[PDB]
Amino acid sequence: MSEIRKDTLKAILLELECHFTWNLLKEDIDLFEVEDTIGQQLEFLKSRLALYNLLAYVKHLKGQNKDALECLEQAEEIIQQEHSDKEEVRSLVTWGNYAWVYYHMDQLEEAQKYTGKIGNVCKKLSSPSNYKLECPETDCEKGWALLKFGGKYYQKAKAAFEKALEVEPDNPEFNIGYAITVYRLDDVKSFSLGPLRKAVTLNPDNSYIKVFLALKLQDVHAEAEGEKYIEEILDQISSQPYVLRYAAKFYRRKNSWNKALELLKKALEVTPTSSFLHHQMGLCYRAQMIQIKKATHNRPKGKDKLKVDELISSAIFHFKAAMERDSMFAFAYTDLANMYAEGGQYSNAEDIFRKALRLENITDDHKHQIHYHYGRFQEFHRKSENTAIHHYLEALKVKDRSPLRTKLTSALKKLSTKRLCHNALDQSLSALGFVYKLEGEKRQAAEYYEKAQKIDPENAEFLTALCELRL
């Protein structure tokens, strides 16, 4: 089992264009969620190729290399299915993935078989490169993979899709990928509306793209036109949980609770293991409940009272279900905890938040939001200013640049100031030092951090902060 040969092979592997070389980092996603999403997208539809390649990479990430190979087998079969003259060239990503998986299974001759096929094809076609072949289809596959890896990848996805569109501006698939990417980037904004209309025009039969157009129309207060698209696709998506859950989102945002629930129930029947779906159901119940409490001025009577009680229990049931199906699905923890807190059940909220705070292997984005919500809980329900500060600070440390940034910095100032009502600053000095360092006030930051070091001369955090401010 030679490290020499392993690294020699690896040098070739790094030359390939495929999921293993596209810097798709497991740290940036919830693997189980991404796996669930891809499985749903594959349901009851051919266009399955990119999804199978990607799913194989995801299986590898989960430590299921055999399942990975199963996915590549399916990808290969689909390529065969197209029966096109472009088989060899259409096979490069799948082959690259095969090479990497076999490499990770300590099976080097097999891996080399695939690198061989790849190099051979690149040779035949006189590629400027030995193991890659410039290809719009590949740019498209890459775009899809990046998109699936989430917000840290959207710009990259957009670039990939643009690159493909460079070659074929009116390719139906490339336009779907581009339009979806711009939609995700809109998440509010409406830059995606034109691209979405064009994508629908190029894909008249496609429910997936229509549902997103409908959502963007809803966003810009064109609810009737949107709803027309939803009705156009309803009969066709009955076994497609991925499309169903977005159509259900459309209804939820229109306050059509029962319709939303109807589609989500259909979706769950196709994929009952899905945390995402259970969580969507929870959001629906919760939203209706909030609506009734609002209309009833927080004093629902009679049947309204019965309904709110039922809705609270259903929401709780589904948030719990989501958590049971994926302990990493952080949103279900925060939504559940927040429901408890709103009902005055502080001990229950605390239990759930505590669980969430102890989850190490979740994404920084989720951690950022968990700290934010626990901070708010501390501030408005526990009335613990000190603890709120701690957690707003942790949220900022995890993610300096997010939508919550201003709220966090502001709140930190406020609370630190409340501290000075009766006591010199203690936690609070660190908070102000951090915030002014962040906002660019080096002098102030320095002062605060100096006081902090005074109090805790051993604190490596303050030491590092002061090392940096020293510059």
Swiss-Prot record:
Domain of life, source organism: Eukaryota
Matches recorded under InterPro entries: TPR-like_helical_dom_sf, TPR_2, TPR_rpt
Subcellular localization: Cell projection, Ruffle membrane
Documented effect of changing K249E: Reduces binding to RNA and DNA
Disulfide bonds listed in the record: none
GO cellular component: actin cytoskeleton; apical part of cell; cytosol; plasma membrane; ruffle membrane
Site (Interaction with the 5'-triphosphate group of PPP-RNA) location in chain: Q280
Effect of R286E: Strongly reduces binding to dsDNA. No effect on ssRNA binding
Alphabetic keyword roster: Antiviral defense, Cell membrane, Cell projection, Immunity, Innate immunity, Membrane, Repeat, RNA-binding, TPR repeat, tRNA-binding
TPR repeats: 49-82, 92-125, 136-171, 179-206, 241-274, 330-363, 368-402, 427-459
Impact when changing Q280E: Abolishes RNA-binding
Effect of Y154 to F/A: No effect on RNA-binding. Reduces PPP-RNA-binding
Site (Interaction with PPP-RNA): E33, T37, Q41, K148, R184, Y242
Conditions for induction: By interferons (IFNs).
One BP annotation, GO: innate immune response
Signal peptide limits: none
Pfam families, A to Z: TPR_10 (PF13374), TPR_12 (PF13424), TPR_2 (PF07719), TPR_8 (PF13181)
Effect the entry attributes to changing E33A: No effect on RNA-binding but changes size profile of RNA bound. Reduces PPP-RNA-binding
Effect of substituting K418A: Reduces RNA-binding. 5 fold reduction in tRNA-binding
Effect of mutating K294A: Reduces RNA-binding
GO molecular function: double-stranded DNA binding; poly(U) RNA binding; RNA binding; RNA cap binding; single-stranded RNA binding; tRNA binding
Domain commentary: RNA recognition is mediated by a convoluted intramolecular fold of the TPR repeats (TPR eddy), which scaffolds unique additional helices that form an RNA binding cleft. Undergoes a conformational change upon RNA-binding: unliganded exists in a more open conformation, facilitating RNA entry.
Quaternary organization: Monomer. Interacts with MAP3K7 and the components of the IKK core complex CHUK, IKBKB and IKBKG; the interaction synergizes the recruitment of IKK to MAP3K7 and enhances IKK phosphorylation.
Family the entry assigns: Belongs to the IFIT family.
Main function: Interferon-induced RNA-binding protein involved in the human innate immune response. Has a broad and adaptable RNA structure recognition important for RNA recognition specificity in antiviral defense. Binds precursor and processed tRNAs as well as poly-U-tailed tRNA fragments. Specifically binds single-stranded RNA bearing a 5'-triphosphate group (PPP-RNA), thereby acting as a sensor of viral single-stranded RNAs.
Name by which UniProt lists this protein: Interferon-induced protein with tetratricopeptide repeats 5
Origin organism lineage: Eukaryota, Metazoa, Chordata, Craniata, Vertebrata
